Design a protein around this ligand. Structure first.
Ligand SMILES: O=C(O)c1ccccc1C(=O)O
Ligand SMILES: O=C(O)c1ccccc1C(=O)O
Length: 297
């Protein structure tokens, strides 16, 4: 299906680690300047994890309408991003769903290596489940994330039973799920669609300890042979995203494992579109989240 016109225009108009991080943040700030986020009440805090303090920001909706806390893990290849880069998305999730959202500043690579952020993300989810009753909410949490953050959400979801972590649903926004296998989309959309082959490779070099880690299920959750009993899943993909096919294949595997699953491909879109508020499809996908979550209770 053709590229979306606004996406086409965006692509046509186009250092040290610290500098690369700053450049990523500058770009996110620019898009938020173009399309300002909704006002939203927030409170910063710090969770004690097994790998150290992890900063969080709790988002409080104007009107609470959803009975589970969301815990959101930002993307950025495990190397980039923070609560501020993903505020545009999280503010909208909060206000549109009417949900309290916990946005997590997990430790970045290469300073922290796999599987440190997985452990931290479990610890924060557990914290949220324990706090939920004092917020007037159910203890079972909804985990969410984009790209690398969708990887984290998916892995947390696979570990949840074993970690005694109650999870009501998982929201995976164009996740990375299989670091072993090449898919057609990974071959065909490797260059020129924002998320590129060279970058994916480099992110893996920063995050993983050794090349063998690609086959670990906590790195590549799509390799897990038993998906039965996992949390209800919303899997959103973009048509022209190298990660599309692994996302869609995981959704099919969940569906066939009896997991209530909604799989939505946004046609004409690219990786990253749910943190790019220049595209109306970002809000459409947030509405999809709200509609999905209406069905959880
Ligand atoms: O994880 C990713 O794909 C990613 C990679 C580089 C920058 C940003 C992102 C993001 O999702 O926010
Ligand atoms: O296999 C991948 O795509 C991938 C692998 C390692 C780190 C990050 C990613 C990512 O795109 O965010």
């Amino acid at each position: 299906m053709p590229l979306d016109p606004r996406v086409e225009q965006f692509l046509a108009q186009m250092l040290s680690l610290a500098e690369a991080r700053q450049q990523f943040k500058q770009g996110a700030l620019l898009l938020d300047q173009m399309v300002p986020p909704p006002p939203v009440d927030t409170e910063d805090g710090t969770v004690v994890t097994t790998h150290g303090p992890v900063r969080i920001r709790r988002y409080i909706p104007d009107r609470l309408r959803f009975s589970h806390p969301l815990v959101f893990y930002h993307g950025g290849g495990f190397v980039f991003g923070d609560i501020d880069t993903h505020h545009g998305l999280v503010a909208r999730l909060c206000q549109t769903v009417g949900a309290t959202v916990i946005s997590v500043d997990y430790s970045l690579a290469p300073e922290a290596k796999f599987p440190v952020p997985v452990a931290e993300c479990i610890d924060v989810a557990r914290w949220a489940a324990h706090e939920a009753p004092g917020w007037g909410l159910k203890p079972s949490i909804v985990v969410a994330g984009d790209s690398a953050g969708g990887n984290l959400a998916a892995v947390v979801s696979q570990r949840a039973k074993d970690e005694s972590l109650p999870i009501a649903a998982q929201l995976l926004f164009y996740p990375a799920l299989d670091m072993v296998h090449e898919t057609p989309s990974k071959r065909d959309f490797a260059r020129g669609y924002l998320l590129e082959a060279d970058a994916m490779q480099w992110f893996g070099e920063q995050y993983l300890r050794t090349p063998d880690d690609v086959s670990h299920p906590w790195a590549s959750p799509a390799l897990s042979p038993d998906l039965t009993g996992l949390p209800p899943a919303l899997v959103i993909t973009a048509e022209y995203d190298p990660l599309r096919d692994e996302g869609e294949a995981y959704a099919e595997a969940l569906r066939a494992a009896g997991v209530p699953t909604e799989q939505i491909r946004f046609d004409g879109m690219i990786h990253g579109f749910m943190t790019m508020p220049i595209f109306p499809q970002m809000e459409a996908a947030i509405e999809a989240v709200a509609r999905f979550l209406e069905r959880i209770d």
